[PDB]
A paper describes a structure:
Here we describe the discovery and characterisation of endo-acting glycoside hydrolases expressed by mucin-degrading members of the HGM that are able to cleave the O-glycan chains of a range of different animal and human mucins. These O-glycanases display endo-β1,4-galactosidase activity and specifically target the polyLacNAc structures that comprise the main backbone of many mucin glycan chains. All of the GH16 enzymes comprise a β-jellyroll fold, characteristic of the family, consisting of two β-sheets composed of β-strands that form the core fold, which were superimposable with other GH16 structures previously published. Overall these data reveal that the nine GH16 enzymes analysed are endo acting β1,4-galactosidases that display a preference for polyLacNAc structures found in mucins and other similar glycans such as KS.
Crystal trials were set up with both wild-type protein and mutants of the catalytic nucleophile. The apo structures of BACCAC_02680, BACCAC_02680E143Q, BACCAC_03717 and Amuc_0724 were obtained to 2.0, 2.1, 2.1 and 2.7 Å, respectively. BF4060 and BACCAC_02680E143Q have four fingers and BACCAC_03717 and Amuc_0724 have five out of six possible fingers that have been observed previously in other GH16 structures. The −1 subsite in BACCAC_02680E143Q is composed of a number of aromatics, which are also a common feature of the GH16 structures available. This enzyme possesses four fingers (numbers 1, 3, 5 and 6) that extend towards the cleft, with fingers 1 and 3 sandwiching the negative subsites and fingers 5 and 6 sandwiching the positive subsites. Finger 3 contains the sequence motif for GH16 subfamily 3, which consists of three tryptophans interspaced by other residues. For example, BACCAC_02680 residues W131 and W138 are platforms for the −1 and −2 sugars, respectively.
Numbering used by the authors: 34 to 274
């Protein structure tokens, strides 16, 4: 029961322009190097893949990323098949979801199906953010501390999150990794916002290094590792029975 699928096999060199929008600059770790990215120069559809490129163009770091203009309800599972072409030190690829039309971050939550950093190069991270976890200023969220530590992100894997009123279930390659559960506190506490807003799909390969003179989580950029790409074979949203 498929609510949405993109196989990136349209007769087009860019992703569906009604569904996918190019990521824009913001002064944060994942967004700082969308600055000066000229249209689709780091984003194409080729050979059935969405290809998101991270590179240094003439001394400027440039990220590759899109986000979905549509969001999805509860009672659904998001599956994204992707690999990195290459491990890149300073590389910061991600597959994740933001609420559409929620209050200021992180009051509507955030779901990360996949982030990779050089600091733990044989795992990925699956993470949840809420106002109840992060408060005003926090940015760590709650992450799967028992994440697979013997994992090769440069092979194809299916990253998934099943979102219901009761819980988020995380999977890698169809295998459950962890659960973030509704505690059913007063709504006032903002502990489980995940069914009050549609959630979109964000696919990016970003570059880390320092943000305002402070080392980001993905850490130092090694220019000799660039360029790198994330290849997304498909995204689908399944409606649960
Ligand atoms: Ca494909």
């Amino acid at each position: 029961n498929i609510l949405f699928v993109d196989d990136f096999d349209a007769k087009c060199i860019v992703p569906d322009t009604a569904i996918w929008k190019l990521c824009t600059y913001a002064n944060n770790a994942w967004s700082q190097y969308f600055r000066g990215v000229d249209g689709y120069e780091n984003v194409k559809v080729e050979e059935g893949y969405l290809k998101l490129r991270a590179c240094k163009d003439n001394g400027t770091y440039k990220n590759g990323g899109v986000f979905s203009k549509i969001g999805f309800p509860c009672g659904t599972r998001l599956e994204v098949k992707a690999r990195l072409t290459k491990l890149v030190r300073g590389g910061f690829p991600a597959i994740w979801q933001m609420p559409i039309g929620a209050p200021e971050w992180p009051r509507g939550g955030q779901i990360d199906l996949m982030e990779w950093v050089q600091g733990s190069p044989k795992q990925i991270f699956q993470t949840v953010h809420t106002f109840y976890i992060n408060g005003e200023n926090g940015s760590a969220g709650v992450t799967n501390k028992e994440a697979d530590k013997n994992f090769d992100v440069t092979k194809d894997h299916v990253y998934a999150v099943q979102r219901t009123e009761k819980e988020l279930i995380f999977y890698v390659d169809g295998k459950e990794t962890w659960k973030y559960e509704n505690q059913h506190l007063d709504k006032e506490k903002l502990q489980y916002p995940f069914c009050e807003y549609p959630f979109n799909i964000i696919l990016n390969f970003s570059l880390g290094g320092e943000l305002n003179g402070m080392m980001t989580w993905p850490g130092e950029i090694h220019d000799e590792d660039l360029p790198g790409e994330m290849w997304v074979d498909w995204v689908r949203v399944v409606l649960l029975d």
